[PDB]
Amino acid sequence: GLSDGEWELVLKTWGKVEADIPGHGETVFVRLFTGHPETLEKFDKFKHLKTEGEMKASEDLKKQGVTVLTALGGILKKKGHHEAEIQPLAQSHATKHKIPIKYLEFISDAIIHVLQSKHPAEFGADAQGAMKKALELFRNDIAAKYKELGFQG
Template sequence: MSDFDTVLASWGKVESNISGLGGEVLTRLFTEHPDTQQLFPKFTGIARGDLAGNAAVADHGKTVLIKLGEIIKAKGSSDTIKPLATTHANKHKIGLNNFNLITEVIIKLFGEKGIWDAAAQDALRKVMASVVNEIGCVYKQLGFAG
């Protein structure tokens, strides 16, 4: 079974609560890595204590997980990754390390919630290493130092 298939085997658990989990992912990201909150201009004015349960944070977290699901379902296809990488370089100016940070937050949170066992967590780590590498290649083509 490929790493993509390992992650997909339990992706339904993520989709069943994608908005709630998305909000938790971003809340945890902003709490554990406070500097990342500044990368999201619409969230900069939200106090850390007000992140959990914030509808806008949950909505954007849902978007993040939907896009992650699309990438996983497409098995890391360049056709799926390139548009994301392009907007994250040209518009959002998101450095590559931030993809690694959110990956670890997702792995930790989903492990704590029993969504992913150790094998699925390891599989996502491998999948995202490949995805981040692909994003880095696009960044290089675009001349973004991210």
């Protein structure tokens, strides 16, 4: 996993996300959908949004952003002891939503990009490295659960 030092950097960084969860959540989805349009086909409630302007204006899309970052924040706060919180999530994503593990890689990249754009001077190589390692741990644990459930991880 990560050292206590690395977890400290991930939590301080997350401190910046918590100051505007809706703003960061909205940007992560606009990057994700514009960057990897196939991901949009998994959200039956958003498929009709075709332009960047329509996405930016969607309060429903902003609410989804809040849901995702709220859940992820709760997990990162566990510093690796997140067996309990990941289980339900792998379960719904694999079996109900049908999200390939690769889309979790796309959304992680989107998170890194938003942090770079919104906090360019404050999100340095140390904080970025730690944030990448935490998201990698998170994805690897989900992937492990997908395999347990009989899906490709």
